[PDB]
Amino acid sequence: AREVITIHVGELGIQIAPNFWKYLCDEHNIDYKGQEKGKIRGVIDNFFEKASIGKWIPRTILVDLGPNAIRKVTKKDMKDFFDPKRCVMGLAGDANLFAKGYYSYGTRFMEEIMDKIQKEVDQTEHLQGFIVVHSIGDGTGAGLAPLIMEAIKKKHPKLVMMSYSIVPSQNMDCSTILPYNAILSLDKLTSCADISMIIDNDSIYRIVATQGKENELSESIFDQVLAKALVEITATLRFNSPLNRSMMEMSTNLVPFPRNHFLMTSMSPLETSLTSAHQKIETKELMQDLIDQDHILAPITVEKGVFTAFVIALRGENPHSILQNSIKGFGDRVKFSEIFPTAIKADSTTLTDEKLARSGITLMNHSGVANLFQFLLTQFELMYDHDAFTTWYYQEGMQPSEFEAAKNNIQKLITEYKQDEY
Amino acid sequence: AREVITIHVGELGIQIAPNFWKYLCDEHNIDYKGQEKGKIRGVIDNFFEKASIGKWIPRTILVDLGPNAIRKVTKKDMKDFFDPKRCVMGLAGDANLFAKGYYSYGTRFMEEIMDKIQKEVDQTEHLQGFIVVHSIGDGTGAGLAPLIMEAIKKKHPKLVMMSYSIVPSQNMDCSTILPYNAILSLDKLTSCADISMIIDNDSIYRIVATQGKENELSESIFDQVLAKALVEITATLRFNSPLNRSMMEMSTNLVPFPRNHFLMTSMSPLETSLTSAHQKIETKELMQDLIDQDHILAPITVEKGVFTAFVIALRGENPHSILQNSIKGFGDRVKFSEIFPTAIKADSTTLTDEKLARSGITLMNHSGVANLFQFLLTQFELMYDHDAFTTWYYQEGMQPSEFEAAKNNIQKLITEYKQDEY
Amino acid sequence: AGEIVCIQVGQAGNQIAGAFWQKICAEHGIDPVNGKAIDVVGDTDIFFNTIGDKYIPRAVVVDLEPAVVENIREKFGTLFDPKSIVSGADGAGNNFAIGFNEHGAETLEKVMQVVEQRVSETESIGGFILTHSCGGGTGSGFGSKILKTIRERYPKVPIFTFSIFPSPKISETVVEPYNAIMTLSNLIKYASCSIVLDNEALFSIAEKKLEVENPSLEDLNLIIAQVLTNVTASLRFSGTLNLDLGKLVTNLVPFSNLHFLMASTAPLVLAGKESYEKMTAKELSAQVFGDEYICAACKPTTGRYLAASVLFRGAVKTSDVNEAMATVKEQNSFVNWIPTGFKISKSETSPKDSALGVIMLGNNSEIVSVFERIGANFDRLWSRKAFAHWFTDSGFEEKDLDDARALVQKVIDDYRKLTEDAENLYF
Numbered sequence A, B: 001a002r003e004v005i006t007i008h009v010g011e012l013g014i015q016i017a018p019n020f021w022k023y024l025c026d027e028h029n030i031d032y033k034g035q036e037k038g039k040i041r042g043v044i045d046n047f048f049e050k051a052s053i054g055k056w057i058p059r060t061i062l063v064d065l066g067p068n069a070i071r072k073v074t075k076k077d078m079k080d081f082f083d084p085k086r087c088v089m090g091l092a093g094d095a096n097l098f099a100k101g102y103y104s105y106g107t108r109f110m111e112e113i114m115d116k117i118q119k120e121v122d123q124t125e126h127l128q129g130f131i132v133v134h135s136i137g138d139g140t141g142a143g144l145a146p147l148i149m150e151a152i153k154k155k156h157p158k159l160v161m162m163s164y165s166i167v168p169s170q171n172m173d174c175s176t177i178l179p180y181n182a183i184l185s186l187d188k189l190t191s192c193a194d195i196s197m198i199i200d201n202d203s204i205y206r207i208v209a210t211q212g213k214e215n216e217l218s219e220s221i222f223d224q225v226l227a228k229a230l231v232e233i234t235a236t237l238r239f240n241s242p243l244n245r246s247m248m249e250m251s252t253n254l255v256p257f258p259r260n261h262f263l264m265t266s267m268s269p270l271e272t273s274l275t276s277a278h279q280k281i282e283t284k285e286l287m288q289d290l291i292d293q294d295h296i297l298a299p300i301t302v303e304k305g306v307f308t309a310f311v312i313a314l315r316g317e318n319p320h321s322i323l324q325n326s327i328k329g330f331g332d333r334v335k336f337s338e339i340f341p342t343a344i345k346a347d348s349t350t351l352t353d354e355k356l357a358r359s360g361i362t363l364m365n366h367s368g369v370a371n372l373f374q375f376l377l378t379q380f381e382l383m384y385d386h387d388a389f390t391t392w393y394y395q396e397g398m399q400p401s402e403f404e405a406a407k408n409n410i411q412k413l414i415t416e417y418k419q420d421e422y
Numbered sequence C: 001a002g003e004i005v006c007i008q009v010g011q012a013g014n015q016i017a018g019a020f021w022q023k024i025c026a027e028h029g030i031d032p033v034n035g036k037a038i039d040v041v042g043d044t045d046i047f048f049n050t051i052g053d054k055y056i057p058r059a060v061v062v063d064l065e066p067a068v069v070e071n072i073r074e075k076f077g078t079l080f081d082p083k084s085i086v087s088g089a090d091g092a093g094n095n096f097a098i099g100f101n102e103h104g105a106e107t108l109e110k111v112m113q114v115v116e117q118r119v120s121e122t123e124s125i126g127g128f129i130l131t132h133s134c135g136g137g138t139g140s141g142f143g144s145k146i147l148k149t150i151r152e153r154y155p156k157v158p159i160f161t162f163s164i165f166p167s168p169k170i171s172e173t174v175v176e177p178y179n180a181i182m183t184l185s186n187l188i189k190y191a192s193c194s195i196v197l198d199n200e201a202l203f204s205i206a207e208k209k210l211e212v213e214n215p216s217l218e219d220l221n222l223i224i225a226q227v228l229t230n231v232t233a234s235l236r237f238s239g240t241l242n243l244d245l246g247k248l249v250t251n252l253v254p255f256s257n258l259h260f261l262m263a264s265t266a267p268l269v270l271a272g273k274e275s276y277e278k279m280t281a282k283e284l285s286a287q288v289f290g291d292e293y294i295c296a297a298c299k300p301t302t303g304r305y306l307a308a309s310v311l312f313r314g315a316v317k318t319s320d321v322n323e324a325m326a327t328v329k330e331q332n333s334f335v336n337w338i339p340t341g342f343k344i345s346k347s348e349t350s351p352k353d354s355a356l357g358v359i360m361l362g363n364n365s366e367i368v369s370v371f372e373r374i375g376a377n378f379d380r381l382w383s384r385k386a387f388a389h390w391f392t393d394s395g396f397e398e399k400d401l402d403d404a405r406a407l408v409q410k411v412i413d414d415y416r417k418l419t420e421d422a423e424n425l426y427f
């Protein structure tokens, strides 16, 4: 079993954990106590460790510079599921600064963190890779997640590392220093991860609100959508799928150059509870929905930008003759460079959710990511050039040239993604 | 991008500005702070300047001989949108006299005004023309707008200049010296503008009141209708329309002789908020509404007078076979001279307003304009011949022959427009 | 971890803090006059030291007054631990110089020993909160020496001060502007954040938003206490995502000397079901950002914001927060360089007398008008040297009175310059 180790870093990555792990528990027929619930299905071993007893243990580590995200997750939301010896807690938190997560505070926990990671690594014969789930907003997520990633890559250089980077909103999750942490941490993700998924919370809020225009939803829906997208990305790593069979294949399919690894996603039906009653989603509509504006979890229109890679992973019966006509029917909405064939790959895997006829998710390497980076970079520059809030970072060791370096690296990254636009 | 510079002159032209500019901001998906709000659509560059940052700047100048119209617009109604370095303010106002706007006070501001205009001109590679929005009532509008127009035509003779001339009402906007300012300023518009639109506020008041006979409306409706008519006239200059593509084409389509440039308009549905609930306006009804008495923003019946030119600009799907039957069906309601073919041109462009199935506006070169001019000229003569209020103009330099010249020019203009009537 | 030590200095300080502690004890479920509880909710460890079944509020109670302990037993029962109460010998007669210079070395050493014990019973220090009044003789001068002393012993720890400033119209004593400037000078140098409150604003609120007829200071303190309990909700009720004092300093203070904040809350409800279930986040945001709930003599809708934060409590819908805040961004005025404007947070636990509630804090350039009025009153008295002997015969030099004024003016000039420059930072 090619086993994956999942690490949740920061208050949001931890907030997500109970939704992510409950989906996996139900998907594979395991209860929330780790007990088997009937017949186990899928390659359970890839995400769960088998205990000396009948219990399955999520193969995961929770990291928080304060005590609170972990305390709520392991004591109130999903009791007895997470192993307490795999939880790392600090006391001070991060004061919302990148500087604490990466230079002044979070560094004292690296021996503890790498020790716990090795203990988890030592339990597996065939380790495929790591998934690091983190916010790029707050200092713990923005700071430690790259600190952890670098420590792992220097010890286990042959593994594939994937990050799930969550970009906070400009409204419900906003912060007055968001642009500093976002640029300072993109600068490190650029050299740290092999694959980096970008999920934009503002897209989630407007997409769910659109789907919910007819009803009252639930406040839990925003977290369920964010958690589900990770579960679906990973579906092919858990079931014997004819696609993204392994993290190494995701890397070879989607990332042509070491720096161009930032990926976008699209998902349909977003959540089962959003699409209820008569939901006979025919193979034809599902593929049109996946390139629709209201299914893309980014401020990206596929028609406005250029594709470098595009993989569509469906679940349930999806006849191949339909998938091919749907792709041909994309026309010029899905366009690549003249140095590439229109390398759009699609197929389907096993469905576990008894309420849905079919579903799917896509992974896109598209130039539109550059627009998010430029948005955040412009905000960074307005603040930086007039020293807003820089004293708080300088006080913890961020010599000013550190900010200048991040500024230049991101502008170069934006420039490179837009090369095919010109 | 063929770029247009918009200038708002006088208390009313300035009053209108926030409605005009908000419509454009929403139409092109820009917020009122100049920030982008999703995907930008239409040729944004024609009316907005791009900042060194992500902000769009309205390409406009605000002129007021007093400080107050500008202060309210830029500090209370549409904050941070208008560039303060493009605002020109005097101290004395105009005492409602043409004489101050054109000879004794407004003249001292011409260096400032032309300097600001050049700074705006210098930012654009391809300048199509200018639009001057002004009252013909009050002295600032009636006086400066032609002073400004002459200064521009003598510097940039190859550009097309259009004015949007708003005729004050005989009730809510009335003044005891309205006939002097109206005749004295029509006399200058006659040689200044290439295209001059005439909008009559009395038509707006009776038309809206008719539409509102079933409800309480809003006091803001009168300004929204007046502002919207300009927005719709300009729609073809902002979208890639098959009509009035440029100001030069509006001039060639509508004005056969240098003096016969005064145009009338007709609009339907007037305002979105006036036509709510079930508003499936079929292509057929829209074209009948556009030549109806209750949609013409002038005291003009199309059946009583002669057309020289007629252009119908629609928005939304409008099948051409319907447009042609609607035109043929005009019969003798729409009649031209025996020296012209019935040159009625109609087509449609892009719709941006999600609440309307379709909409439209017409531009008419029709002899009925002569009736408005004669109405105002008769009032001028009754006052002039008995010296009512002439001391106030003579005190600021208007030697008496100046009034006599305007009187004769307008009577000649009326005579010329009515030639085809006989 | 984010444990809080409160310091209460002087009579106003003790009465305001008293109201706070008694409201905290209602939300957590503790007896306000005994400290005894069986079943409590929330993270009580942030503010209380629990021994057996008694919850002991972590506070240092400070006065110069000869019988401060008895004065507390009479109103607060046994809620406060007497070992934490520091009594004085004579008192400071509304004279900053007595609270600051002539206080007695022993008095200050005892206060510091008590503070050390309170910080010694913590796994970590989350911050300090000082409650006081700028026109007094102990809450001004002694409270100021305490900020100096605390910041020297514990640098890099967020100190929040809540203080009462002179009222805009009528004044209390003639000496008040001298006490107010020197207090402000020390707040400028030592606090991480300071919340500016005054009684004129609070009285208008008490008479118009509360149902109470002819309110006294006892009622007025429930508005201040409501600001204090709401600003600490996320700390007390945890949550996966939350706000500590260090989150507020980082997000609201762009420069080290521009930390003076305004505060506003709604609804204001006196104990009992006297409230109405408006249940609308949109209405609460519209109210909290209006001028009518501002707890200081200023008019924020006419100024410009550098930053602001909003904490929503109770079952507030995400969708309403986003729409409500969109309205706020459109109506108000912000400075361009800070491009995101706000810090937004939610805590699902309702205040005890309302299902929903909102607290807002922020940096509004308008705040200088408070400081400018104080400055001008001082300048007139200082030029004539009226009541001045009371400060120079108590250890100050004219130089100290002049330097304190100069520091205050520097802050005013920095807020105003930034605000005026801001108009063109958009072009």
Ligand SMILES: Nc1nc2c(ncn2[C@@H]2O[C@H](COP(=O)(O)OP(=O)(O)O)[C@@H](O)[C@H]2O)c(=O)[nH]1
Residues within 6 Å of the ligand: C009, C010, C011, C012, C015, C016, C092, C094, C133, C134, C135, C136, C137, C138, C139, C140, C164, C172, C199, C217, C218, C220, C221, C224
């Ligand atoms: N809001 C509020 N204001 C108070 C209270 N008590 C006093 N004040 C204000 O605080 C100012 C200074 O008070 P003071 O009694 O001299 O305090 P001390 O000398 O430092 O102990 C007074 O002039 C009042 O304006 C209170 O209970 N609440």
